[PDB]
Curated annotation (Swiss-Prot):
One of its GO terms (molecular function) is organic anion transmembrane transporter activity. This is Solute carrier organic anion transporter family member 6C1. Coiled coil: none annotated. The keyword Transmembrane helix applies. Belongs to the organo anion transporter (TC 2.A.60) family. It is found in: Cell projection, Cilium, Flagellum membrane. Residues 392-447 form the Kazal-like domain. Disulfide bonds join C398-C428, C404-C424, C413-C445. It is a multi-pass membrane protein. GO terms for cellular component: CatSper complex; motile cilium; plasma membrane. The gene is Slco6c1. Residues 72-79, 162-173, 245-281, 340-352, 497-511 are cytoplasmic.
C-alpha cells in the first residue's frame, strides 16, 4: 500500500539515476581502497610480487566472465532486479575481503608469533616464517574477494547505463554518462583519500620499533572498519532498488511518446557478425584500447616516475597522481559530455570533435616529453662510492652493526649535497628523532662532507630522506599533465556516445557487453606483461646481492624510462589518430550509402 508521492517521484528517470550513482559511488569507493589494500597486503604480509598481480587479475577476469553472460541475461529479464542483486553481491564481497584482516591479524607482527620469535633476540624476531601459513589461507579470502568483486561489479556498470540508454533520451544520456563515470572517479579519490589517512601512520611515525608492531594493528583494523561500513551500504542501496518498479512508470510515459509517430545463439551471432561487418564499432573499440592503455599506464608509471626523476617519496608520489588526475578527469566528462548534450551533436560532428581533442592532447604529452629533457639534481648512482667501494660496497661494516636491510633502503642527504642511500648505512650510530623530522647522528660511513651543517640540542648530523634543490619543474609537469587528462576524459564521451546510435533499441543492452569484453581481456591482460618487461628495461640495476629474483631495483633508468614509456604513449596515442581517420572516411562512405542524395 505504498502509494505515497515519494515512490512516484522515486520511480523518476532520475530516481534510477539517484540510486545508480549511489550504487556507483560506493562501488568507486570500494575498488580504490582495494588496490592499495592488495598492494600493502603483498609487502606487509610476506608475499612476492608474483601473487599480487594474480589477486589483481582476479577482479579483471571476474568482470570478463560476466561482462558477456549478464549482458545476455540483462537482455531477457528485469534490469532493475539484476543490478540490485549485483549490488547485493557487493555487500557480501566487501565484508568478506575484511574477514581475513580481523581473523588473521596474527600473520606477521614483529613479535606476536610468540612460539618462535623471542622478545630479546633480534634475528629470531625476523625469521621462522610462520606468516606464510595463514597467508595463503587469506589469499583464498582475497582471490574470492577479488572475484566476487568483478563478477558482481561489472553488471552494475552495464545494466544501469543500459537503463540510461533505453529509458533516457539521447540529448541527456551524456549528461548521465558523465556523472556515472565521475562517480567512479570520485570514489577513486576518496578510496585513497579517506582510506590512507588511517593507513598513513598516526602522529607517531617516529617511536621505537613498537610502531611497526602498532602500525600493523591499524591497517587490518583500518580496512576491517572501512569495509564493514562499505559492504552494508551496498546492501541498503540494493534493497532500495529492489523496491523500485519492474515496469518503470517514467519510461512507459516516454515509451508511448516514442511508440507513436529470442536471444538465441544464431541471433546472438547475428549481433556478433554485424559488429565486424560495421567498421564503425571496429574503430570505436580499438580507439578505447589506446585510451585505457595510455591512461592506466600513467596512473601507475607516474608515481614511479615522480619517485625516480623528481625523487618523491613512493607513498607521497602515489598521492600526487591520485589527488591530481581526478580534477582533470571529472570535468573532462562533465565539460566533454555537455558539449554533445547541449549541442545535440551528430555522428559526423563527434568524429571531428574526437580528432582535434586527441591531437592537441598528444602534443601536450609531447610537451611533457620536451620538459623531461631539462636536467635535474642527481643523488647516488655516481659509480663506485667516491672510489671507496663499488656499487654494492653498500654492505660495509656500518651495514652490519645497525642491521641495515637492502630492501627498505632510502636515500639520505649529507651536507656535501651528495645523496647517500640507506640512512643507517651512512654509518649513523645514533639517531635522535624530533616531532616533525627524522635525523641521524654519528654518521661514520659519511665522507668528509659536512661544510657548515647545523643543529641545536646536538651539533652536526645528517637529515633523513632525499634533499631536493630544483623540484620547481614539478608545477610545469602537472600543469601539462592536467590538460592531457582533461582531453582524455572528453575523448571517452564521444566514443561511447556514438555506440548507442548505430544499434537498434532492443540490441543496445548487448552493446555495452561487446565493448566491455575487450576492456579486461584484450587490454588489461597483456598490459602488465608489456609494462613488466619494459619496467625492468629501465630497472636493470636490480639488487642482485640480496633480493634474488628481481624484487627491488635501485636504478630506474631516468633517461630510458622517459623515452620508453612516453614514446610508447606516443605510439599508443597515434593509433587513435589512424583508427579515427579510418573511421571518419568509412563513416562518411556508409552515411553516403544511406544518404545518396
Ligand atoms: C656518538 O654520539 C654521542 C652523542 O651523540 C657521543 O657521546 C659521547 O660518548 C662517549 C662514549 O665513549 C662518552 O664518553 C662521552 O661523554 C659522550 N659525549 C657527551 C657529550 O656526552 C659519542 O662520542 C659519539 N661516538 C663517537 C665514536 O664519537
Amino acid at each position: 500500500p505504498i502509494v505515497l508521492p515519494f515512490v512516484q517521484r522515486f520511480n523518476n528517470i532520475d530516481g534510477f539515476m539517484t540510486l545508480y550513482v549511489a550504487a556507483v559511488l560506493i562501488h568507486g569507493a570500494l575498488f580504490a581502497v582495494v588496490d592499495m589494500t592488495l598492494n600493502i597486503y603483498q609487502v606487509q604480509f610476506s608475499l612476492t610480487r608474483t601473487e599480487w598481480y594474480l589477486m589483481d587479475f582476479s577482479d579483471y577476469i571476474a568482470s570478463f566472465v560476466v561482462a558477456i553472460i549478464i549482458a545476455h541475461f540483462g537482455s531477457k529479464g528485469n534490469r532493475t532486479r539484476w543490478i540490485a542483486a549485483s549490488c547485493i553481491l557487493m555487500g557480501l564481497e566487501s565484508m568478506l575481503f575484511a574477514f581475513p584482516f580481523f581473523t588473521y591479524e596474527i600473520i606477521i607482527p614483529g613479535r606476536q608469533s610468540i612460539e618462535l620469535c623471542m622478545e630479546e633476540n633480534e634475528k629470531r624476531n625476523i625469521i621462522c616464517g610462520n606468516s606464510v601459513p595463514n597467508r595463503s589461507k587469506c589469499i583464498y579470502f582475497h582471490i574470492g574477494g577479488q572475484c566476487i568483486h568483478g563478477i558482481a561489479g561489472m553488471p552494475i556498470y552495464i545494466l544501469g547505463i543500459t537503463f540510461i540508454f533505453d529509458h533516457i533520451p539521447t540529448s541527456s544520456c551524456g549528461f548521465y554518462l558523465a556523472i556515472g563515470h565521475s562517480a567512479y572517479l570520485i570514489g577513486y579519490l576518496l578510496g585513497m583519500v579517506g582510506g590512507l589517512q588511517n593507513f598513513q601512520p598516526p602522529p607517531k611515525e617516529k617511536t621505537v620499533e613498537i610502531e611497526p608492531a602498532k602500525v600493523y594493528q591499524l591497517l587490518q583494523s583500518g580496512w576491517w572498519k572501512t569495509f564493514l561500513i562499505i559492504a552494508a551500504i551496498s546492501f541498503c542501496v540494493s534493497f532500495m532498488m529492489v523496491c523500485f518498479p519492474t515496469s518503470l512508470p517514467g519510461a512507459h510515459k516516454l515509451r508511448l511518446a516514442k511508440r507513436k509517430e529470442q536471444p538465441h545463439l544464431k541471433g546472438f551471432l547475428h549481433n556478433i557478425w554485424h559488429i565486424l561487418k560495421n567498421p564503425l564499432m571496429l574503430t570505436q573499440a580499438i580507439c578505447k584500447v589506446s585510451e585505457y592503455l595510455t591512461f592506466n599506464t600513467s596512473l601507475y608509471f607516474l608515481p614511479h616516475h615522480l619517485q625516480t626523476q623528481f625523487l618523491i617519496t613512493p607513498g607521497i608520489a602515489s598521492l600526487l597522481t591520485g589527488a591530481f588526475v581526478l580534477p582533470g578527469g571529472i570535468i573532462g566528462h562533465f565539460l566533454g559530455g555537455l558539449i554533445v548534450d547541449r549541442l545535440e551533436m551528430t555522428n559526423k560532428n563527434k568524429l571531428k570533435f574526437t580528432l582535434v581533442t586527441t591531437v592537441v592532447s598528444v602534443g601536450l604529452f609531447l610537451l611533457i616529453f620536451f620538459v623531461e629533457c631539462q636536467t635535474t639534481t642527481f643523488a647516488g648512482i655516481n659509480e663506485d662510492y667516491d672510489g671507496y667501494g663499488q656499487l654494492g660496497n653498500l654492505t660495509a661494516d656500518c651495514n652490519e652493526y645497525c642491521d641495515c636491510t637492502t630492501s627498505l633502503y632510502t636515500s639520505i642527504c649529507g651536507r656535501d649535497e651528495k645523496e647517500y642511500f640507506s640512512p643507517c648505512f651512512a654509518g649513523c650510530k645514533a639517531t635522535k628523532v624530533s616531532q616533525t623530522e627524522k635525523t641521524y647522528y654519528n654518521c661514520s660511513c659519511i665522507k668528509e662532507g659536512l661544510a657548515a651543517s647545523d643543529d641545536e640540542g646536538q651539533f652536526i648530523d645528517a637529515i633523513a630522506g632525499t634533499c631536493d634543490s630544483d623540484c620547481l619543474k614539478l608545477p610545469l609537469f602537472f600543469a601539462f599533465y592536467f590538460s592531457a587528462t582533461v582531453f582524455s576524459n572528453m575523448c571517452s564521451i564521444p566514443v561511447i556516445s556514438i555506440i548507442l546510435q548505430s544499434v537498434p533499441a532492443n540490441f543496445t543492452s548487448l552493446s555495452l557487453g561487446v565493448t566491455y569484453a575487450i576492456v579486461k581481456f584484450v587490454a588489461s591482460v597483456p598490459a602488465p606483461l608489456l609494462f613488466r618487461l619494459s619496467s625492468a628495461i629501465a630497472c636493470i640495476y636490480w639488487d642482485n646481492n640480496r633480493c634474488g629474483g628481481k624484487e627491488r631495483c635501485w636504478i630506474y633508468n631516468k633517461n630510458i624510462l622517459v623515452y620508453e614509456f612516453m614514446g610508447i604513449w606516443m605510439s599508443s596515442q597515434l593509433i587513435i589518430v589512424l583508427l579515427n581517420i579510418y573511421a571518419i572516411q568509412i563513416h562518411d562512405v556508409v552515411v553516403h550509402g544511406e544518404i545518396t542524395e
